[PDB]
């Protein structure tokens, strides 16, 4: 009663969502009040003012222009701040009371579909997490693509590997979640009510959204813990969008058995997309990525993060890439003009697509027939299958050309989007507007343009499933064409898959180093087999002991993304997990951090695992480090029976081949001719018994007695041993 | 212009052509690359903003001549302008000349008038001198054989051979000083150094186009009269600059709350040149103890003094500005109150320092009368330079006392705040410390620093440091060296009591070197340097020594390095060694004693005690750390089996 009718309406609207900020449309500004005005002034840096106190109560107020809202939304999403958007639904002149305002959408870091808020080559994801005594249910939704996934990771360590791989911009969780260490520090962190994670409500909700009576159609019925998170995520997405989500037409279970399980730590060391420094330079992706479209880059980045294990999918991709290699020069320019179809289709599905997006959609439709013509000559069963999957949609292109001008404006607010004569009534209203060169006829024309603009979505709504299938094939083709182009330019050769685990490489060249090094990369062959599983690496510092191992792992990863390899020939055996340990500096004390990942390597690793221990035995006491690494390799080669490329400074771990089977010493050797040392960066058998250090002692010579005394001591140490 | 450029063709020239000093041909190309000004060949920059571009070029070590006839040559060595000078870092100018007998190295601090000379015996000493001076500019002769030391230095200048003739130098140095014989400064018996001095004096004269009366003396820096720190040791102790190149977490950052930048520079010079004579140190300590009671009163008055030493040199060069004169008159106003506070103090050096500062009351009256139209003010300071010239020698003595007093007061304030106690000097070369506290970490760490005693003697010369990483294995040795260095600067020490023995050289080989000369080559180069130039009076701090890529290879080198350091060199050492095979040295070699910092393990928590004790931890914090975030119990058990095997075989 004390509040004026406009504030009474706002107070109830804020009461619906009191834990999140709200943008309330008034005139041309979204006004924030009281505590919200205070927070906005702190982050958006907008002036905090006070709304005039006609009621008498002070109302702290802040306002931002509607046309520049996206910039403020970007600032909030970086801070992980959820914001609700509310708009005037009724016409204010007709409404005697405050105009009926409703929350149109809730902008949350997870459900941002606006292109302005999305990095082009990075996928945005929304996920929720739930904990049962038995295990954890983790769900993920790519709202920007409609891609929906689910998983049930067995333990806390798996939860961390999944959380880094997904890197969710927003994470939902429950008040009862016990392990708050993993949850804390995540951006856009949300706590939720217990009732949202009920299994029965989820079973009905998922079936209703899909339209399928049984989730058995997607093989998710046997995993209830994950479904509970999915239902909350689906409800949260439905609540955040306030609309149906037809594009989210399927659920998939990401099976640990069907993919290479890379620990979060291995991912940072490989520098797959982001370096240890946090840069996007010297990455495996930049060397492997010269793709024309962002959709292809994201699919490539997803492929890198999720290497597939099934042989059939790999054999299908390689044959296609080899066939496409001849036409790659013709294919790359046409695919560039396709545009961001996957995000454009999701915006169309949400009815939030803009005319510029529609121009790219029709433009992609124009590129499809030429692609079909070039693909028809290519003789491969998958290439023809991809050609069929794209579809024609020529009638829809004709409809779009008829219903949109060739170069449309960004906003439908000012019109001039529909091509003339699509609607005889539209041209009739436009004729009155051009007659002067009438405000009611201008409004009639604009409202008709908006009504037809809604109809354009309705015309394309039935084919949305086919259009989504088309975008899946086009991005899929872009990756295959790029891998062929890179293979032709960087002389990559296809690697055969063999039944037994084991990697054999000939003339192996590390991809990132060879591209970024002016001096030639000296290539080295490597062999891993049931017998050649363990290689101890020794040699001079700055001798690239670390790079030799990185080359093998990146080659092994590339083999499982289905691409060619920077070697004359590669032979690869099935691999379940890739483990990497590199101890370089304190992050827990350095040794504690080194031990934590190593403990994980000692339990998780299995016969199909590839391990890359580096600088192990960095134990502060030489006796202490020697005891742990010597046992760690022995356990890695006695029970785990994994493949390892141990990089060890220790010269006492070079006696392993005599004591243990499967170990083989290999050393990168720097040559010394006269008084000059050279870095060969090449791999040779065994190790340099007389280290470069004695010769280095002669360079910038220490007193001759001192160098002689060392020779006496080195002879004494080896002889006593 | 072509004739003017021909006179100095090896350096850039600013040619006055309106505000824009127009540069042409190759000079225009270089200016476009560095000043980032568009190349049109010709380039130009405004006369009023010349100082900003000069600063950009000086950082790059590019000498520039200024012509209006060349009026002056602005070179990185002779930058007297305050805008081009870091307030708390010394700027120097030096030349180097090579004879078959040895090398002659000269240095001139143009910003103080302090002129020094030396004849280092070999190439390794030249590098130590070059880094200590860090000369922003270095002059050398076309015949110089060892170009490895010269190349990579900023402001590198090649010079004609005739400039390095001994006869011209003997006459030139005598003429500038006005003394018939250089025997008055004891430099006559060192001709190789004098040749460099003459070129440097001529170069300074050529660069300024004027006489240099402030340069009234030359001194021979005798290796016997100072502690000789090698270039590498200086980078590791982070005395003024950290390994990262920052000015943070430095011994200077903790020891420097000086009220005037001159005091910081004098402190930095004292740190860079520790004195060996006991009398100068006993004089300083008695003064600091007497000042400790009045430190609170002394600090505010000394802050108002200003940068007198650089102001006097600018006054001497006739390049001082009125803002500097306001600080000079202000310092003159502060002197009587200082004399009043110092008069009550009962100490022989404090009264001697009081006499050295003097009154200069007539000069203060003249300055108050002559300072509160740029041409009129410029005329005024030029007149003032002439008036203050006869007393310039006394004023230079006054700035030496004022900066010296600021250092003693700052050290007393630090002593009062951080409970520093004076260290007595002993004839025998041994360092005994009680409740020793490392200065930097106790001043940047929230949790309490745990202090530890250390003993070094003719018998306790070598200490092997072992124990956990992140256990301050490195910090303990750094604490002793910084204390030993601080004892020879004459300051109090962060401990209950310190006893110090005479030290000729401080050598350090800090570890963790992963920068490419390969890393191991750089590592042995500094070790080779120590084992050739170390003596009985040397204090050595090998750290992470024996980081040979092959553990067997590194073990032979470090084990031998220690044996040579304790059989012939007989120096004092604080070896920090990861190797647990160097813990057997006390049985094998006399003079070695094991000391270890051990993080304790009680229940499921590790505590960083940072406490020093005799012996070493056979069971490392790592076996306990293996239990935390536990590896499979069999794996940790297998390490115990191996740890028992490794120690038992030894
Ligand atoms: N095969 C190679 N051919 C040529 N240069 C190489 C090769 N491998 C490495 N390098 C170079 O040598 C350097 C070695 O650095 P790094 O791999 O960190 O050495 P280490 O692992 O021995 O410490 C690399 O930065 C790279 O420039
Ligand atoms: N007495 C002390 N008590 C607690 N922490 C300390 C103490 N002395 C130093 N530290 C802290 O512990 C750290 C140990 O790391 P670091 O000095 O790199 O180890 P190390 O000297 O073995 O290389 C120091 O950097 C400092 O932050």
Task: Give start-end residues of each CATH 1.10.1420.10 domain in chain A.
Answer: 272-489
CATH assignment of B93-221, among 3.90.1150.10, 3.30.565.10, 2.60.40.10, 3.30.420.110: 3.30.420.110
Q: Which one of A622, A625, A696 has the shortest CB-CB distance to B518?
A: A696
Sign (positive or negative) of CA dihedral B106, B107, B110, B115: negative
Looking only at Cα atoms, what is the longest distance across chain A? 107
**Cα distances (angstroms) measured from residue B207 to each of A456, B159, B322:** 81, 14, 23
Rounded to a whole number of angstroms, the CA Rg of chain A reads 31
φ and ψ at B444, to 5 degrees? -130, 10
Sheet holding A504-508, edge to edge: A496-497, A569-572, A504-508, A524-527
Give the separation between CA B394 and CA B359, rounded to whole angstroms: 10
Give the separation between CA B263 and CA B88, rounded to whole angstroms: 9
Domain B424-617 CATH class label: alpha beta
- Confirm or reject contact between B361 and chain A (CB < 8 A): no
Instruction: Count how many residues are written for chain A.
Output: 721
Residue A402, both tokens: 């008829």
Give the separation between CA A551 and CA A645, rounded to whole angstroms: 11
Q: Which residues of A touch B639 (CB under 8 A)?
A: 627-628, 631
Q: How close is the nearest chain A Cα to the Cα of B465, in Å?
A: 11
Sign (positive or negative) of CA dihedral A703, A708, A711, A713: negative
**Cα distances (angstroms) measured from residue B599 to each of A23, A315, B253, B474, B611:** 55, 56, 28, 14, 8
Q: Which residues of A touch B552 (CB under 8 A)?
A: 651-652, 691, 714, 717-718
User: Which residue's CA is the nearest one to ligand 1's atom 24?
Assistant: A544
Report whether residue A522 contacts ligand 1, using a CB cutoff of 6 Å. yes
The SS3 call for residue B468 is coil
Q: Which one of B470, B524, B631 has the shortest CB-CB distance to A590?
A: B470
Task: Give start-end residues of each CATH 1.10.1420.10 domain in chain B.
Answer: 256-418
CATH 2.40.100.20 assigned to domain B2-74? The reply is no
CATH of segment(s) B256-418: 1.10.1420.10
- Confirm or reject contact between B648 and chain A (CB < 8 A): no
Enumerate residues lining ligand 2, CB below 6 A. B 441, 445, 447, 449-450, 469-475, 608, 610
Give the separation between CA B77 and CA B140, rounded to whole angstroms: 13
Report whether residue A678 contacts ligand 1, using a CB cutoff of 6 Å. no
Q: Which one of A586, A635, A651 has the shortest CB-CB distance to B550?
A: A651
The total of other beta-carbon atoms located within 10 Å of residue B386's CB is 9
Give the separation between CA A284 and CA A677, rounded to whole angstroms: 31
Query: Which spans in A461-585 are helix H?
Result: 464-489, 511-516, 545-560
The SS3 call for residue A102 is strand
- Confirm or reject contact between B243 and chain A (CB < 8 A): no
CATH of segment(s) A496-689: 3.40.50.300
User: Which residue's CA is the nearest one to ligand 2's atom 13?
Assistant: B470
The SS3 call for residue B572 is strand
Sign (positive or negative) of CA dihedral A643, A647, A648, A654: positive
Query: Which spans in B453-545 are helix H?
Result: 473-488, 519-533
Residue of chain B with shortest Cα separation from A541: B549
Give the separation between CA A260 and CA A257, rounded to whole angstroms: 8
- Confirm or reject contact between A489 and chain B (CB < 8 A): no
Nearest partner of A64 among A29, A107, A32, A23, judged by Cα: A29
- Confirm or reject contact between B594 and chain A (CB < 8 A): no
Give the separation between CA A509 and CA B515, rounded to whole angstroms: 24
Sheet holding A147-151, edge to edge: A189-192, A170-174, A126-131, A136-142, A147-151, A252-253
Q: Which one of B549, B551, B647 has the shortest CB-CB distance to A541?
A: B549
Give the separation between CA A277 and CA B387, rounded to whole angstroms: 61
Give the separation between CA B15 and CA B25, rounded to whole angstroms: 13
User: Per-residue DSSP letters for B322-350?
Assistant: HHHHHHHHHHHHHHHHHHHHHHHS--HHH
Which residues, other chains included, contact A609 with Cβ-Cβ below 8 Å and sequence gap of 6+? Answer: A575, A576, A577, A578, A579, A640, A642, A643
**Cα distances (angstroms) measured from residue A716 to each of A713, B565, B588:** 5, 20, 14
**Cα distances (angstroms) measured from residue B115 to each of A530, B190, B231:** 74, 15, 21
CATH architecture observed for domain A272-489: Orthogonal Bundle (1.10)
Resolution stated for this PDB structure, in Å: 4.8
SS3 labels along A61-83: EEEEEHHHHHHHHHHHHHHCCCE
- Burial class, A15, CB count within 10 angstroms (exposed 0-12 / middle 13-18 / buried 19+): exposed
Give the separation between CA A27 and CA A457, rounded to whole angstroms: 29
Ligand closest to CA B473 = 2
Give the separation between CA B428 and CA B206, rounded to whole angstroms: 49
CATH 3.30.420.110 assigned to domain A118-254? The reply is yes
User: Per-residue DSSP letters for A432-455?
Assistant: HHHHH--HHHHHHHHHHHHHHHHH
Angle at B614 between CA B612 and CA B615, to 5 degrees: 115
Give the method used: cryo-EM
Q: Please indicate whether, in this complex, the C-beta atoms of A620 and B625 are within 8 angstroms of each other.
A: no
Distance A546 CA to ligand 1 centre (A): 8
- Burial class, B650, CB count within 10 angstroms (exposed 0-12 / middle 13-18 / buried 19+): exposed
CATH architecture observed for domain A5-107: 3-Layer(aba) Sandwich (3.40)
Q: At what angle do helices A381-390 and A464-489 cross, to 10 degrees?
A: 140
Task: Give start-end residues of each CATH 3.40.50.300 domain in chain B.
Answer: 424-617
φ and ψ at B243, to 5 degrees? -60, -35
Distance A692 CA to ligand 1 centre (A): 17
Judge whether B540 and B484 are in contact, CB under 8 Å: no
Q: Which atom of ligand 2 is nearest to the CA of A586?
A: 18
Task: Give start-end residues of each CATH 3.40.1170.10 domain in chain A.
Answer: 5-107
Judge whether B445 and B471 are in contact, CB under 8 Å: no
Give the separation between CA A309 and CA A576, rounded to whole angstroms: 8
Residue A374, both tokens: 């070039």
Identify the residue whose tokens are 């004609």: B160
User: Which residue's CA is the nearest one to ligand 2's atom 17?
Assistant: B472
Identify the residue whose tokens are 């002779």: B78
Residue B423, both tokens: 């260290």
Ligand closest to CA B549 = 1
Judge whether B64 and B165 are in contact, CB under 8 Å: no
Give the separation between CA A263 and CA A256, rounded to whole angstroms: 12
User: Which residue's CA is the nearest one to ligand 1's atom 8?
Assistant: A544
Q: Which one of A586, A592, A626 has the shortest CB-CB distance to B625?
A: A592
Give the separation between CA B547 and CA A618, rounded to whole angstroms: 12
- The DSSP output letter for A90 is S
Judge whether A240 and A287 are in contact, CB under 8 Å: no
Strand partners, A158: none
- The DSSP output letter for B92 is -
Give the separation between CA A190 and CA A437, rounded to whole angstroms: 56
Q: Ligand 1 test: best mutation among A271, A277, A513, most atoms within 8 Å of CB?
A: A513
């Amino acid at each position: 009663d004390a509040h004026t009718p406009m504030m009474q309406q706002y107070l109830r609207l804020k009461a619906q969502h009191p834990e999140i900020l709200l943008f309330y449309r008034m005139g041309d500004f979204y006004e924030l009040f009281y505590d919200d005005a205070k927070r906005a002034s702190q982050l958006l840096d907008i002036s905090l003012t006070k709304r005039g106190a006609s009621a008498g109560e002070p109302i702290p107020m802040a306002g931002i222009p509607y046309h520049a809202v996206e910039n403020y939304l970007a600032k909030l999403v970086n801070q992980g701040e959820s914001v609700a958007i509310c708009e005037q639904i009724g016409d204010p002149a007709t409404s005697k009371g405050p105009v009926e305002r409703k929350v149109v959408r809730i902008v949350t870091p997870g459900t941002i579909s606006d292109e302005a808020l999305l990095q082009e080559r990075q996928d945005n994801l929304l996920a929720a997490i739930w904990q049962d005594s038995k295990g954890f249910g983790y769900a993920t939704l790519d709202i920007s693509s409609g891609r929906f996934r689910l998983s049930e990771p067995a333990d806390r360590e798996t939860m961390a590997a999944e959380l880094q791989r997904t890197n969710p911009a927003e994470l939902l969780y429950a008040e009862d979640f016990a392990e708050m260490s993993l949850i804390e520090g995540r951006r856009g962190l949300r706590r939720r009510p217990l009732w949202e994670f009920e299994i029965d409500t989820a079973r009905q909700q998922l079936n209703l959204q899909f339209g399928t009576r049984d989730l058995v159609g997607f093989g998710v019925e046997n995993a209830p813990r994950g479904l509970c998170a999915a239902g909350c995520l689906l409800q949260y997405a439905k609540d955040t969008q306030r609309t149906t989500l037809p594009h989210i037409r399927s659920i998939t279970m990401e099976r640990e058995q069907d993919s290479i399980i890379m620990d979060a730590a291995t991912r940072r060391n490989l520098e797959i997309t982001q370096n240890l420094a946090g840069g996007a330079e010297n990455t495996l992706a930049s060397v492997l990525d010269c793709t024309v479209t962002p959709m292809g880059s994201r699919m490539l980045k997803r492929w890198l993060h999720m290497p597939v294990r099934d042989t059939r999918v790999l054999l299908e991709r390689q044959q296609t890439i080899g066939a496409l290699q001849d036409f790659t020069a013709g294919l790359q320019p046409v695919l560039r003009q396709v545009g961001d179809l996957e995000r454009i289709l999701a915006r169309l599905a949400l009815r939030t697509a803009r005319p510029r997006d529609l121009a790219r959609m029709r433009h992609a439709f124009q590129q499809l027939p030429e692609l079909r013509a070039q693909l028809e000559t290519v003789d491969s069963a998958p290439v023809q299958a991809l050609r069929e999957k794209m579809g024609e949609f020529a009638e829809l292109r004709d409809l779009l050309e008829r219903a949109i001008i060739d170069t449309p404006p960004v906003l439908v607010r000012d019109g001039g989007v529909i091509a003339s004569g699509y609607n005889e009534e539209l041209d009739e209203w436009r004729a009155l507007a051009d007659g002067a060169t009438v405000l009611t006829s201008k409004g009639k024309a604009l409202a008709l343009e908006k009504q037809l603009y809604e109809e354009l979505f309705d015309l394309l709504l039935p084919h949305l499933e086919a259009l989504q299938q088309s975008a899946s094939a086009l991005a899929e083709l872009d990756v295959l064409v790029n891998l062929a182009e890179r293979a032709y330019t960087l002389n990559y050769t296809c690697p055969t898959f063999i039944d037994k685990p084991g990697i054999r490489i000939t003339e192996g060249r590390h991809p990132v180093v060879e591209q970024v090094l002016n001096e030639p990369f000296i290539a080295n062959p490597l062999n891993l087999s049931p017998q050649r599983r363990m290689l101890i690496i020794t040699g001079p510092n700055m001798g690239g002991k670390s790079t030799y191992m990185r080359q093998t792992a990146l080659i092994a990863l590339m083999a499982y993304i289905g691409s060619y390899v920077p070697a004359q020939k590669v032979e690869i055996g099935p691999i379940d997990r890739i483990f990497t340990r590199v101890g370089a500096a304190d992050d827990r004390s350095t040794f504690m951090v080194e031990m934590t990942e190593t403990a994980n390597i000692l339990h998780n690793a299995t016969e199909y695992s590839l391990v890359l221990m580096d600088e192990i035995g960095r134990g502060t006491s030489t006796y202490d480090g020697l005891s742990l690494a010597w046992a760690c390799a022995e356990n890695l080669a006695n029970k785990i029976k994994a493949l390892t490329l141990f990089a060890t400074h220790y010269f006492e771990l070079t006696q392993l081949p005599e004591k243990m089977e499967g170990v083989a010493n290999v050393h990168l050797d720097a040559l010394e001719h006269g008084d000059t040392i050279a870095f060969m960066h090449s791999v040779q058998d065994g190790a340099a018994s007389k280290s470069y250090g004695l010769a280095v002692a002669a360079l910038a010579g220490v007193p001759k007695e001192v160098i002689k005394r060392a020779r006496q001591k080195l002879r004494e140490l080896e002889s006593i041993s």
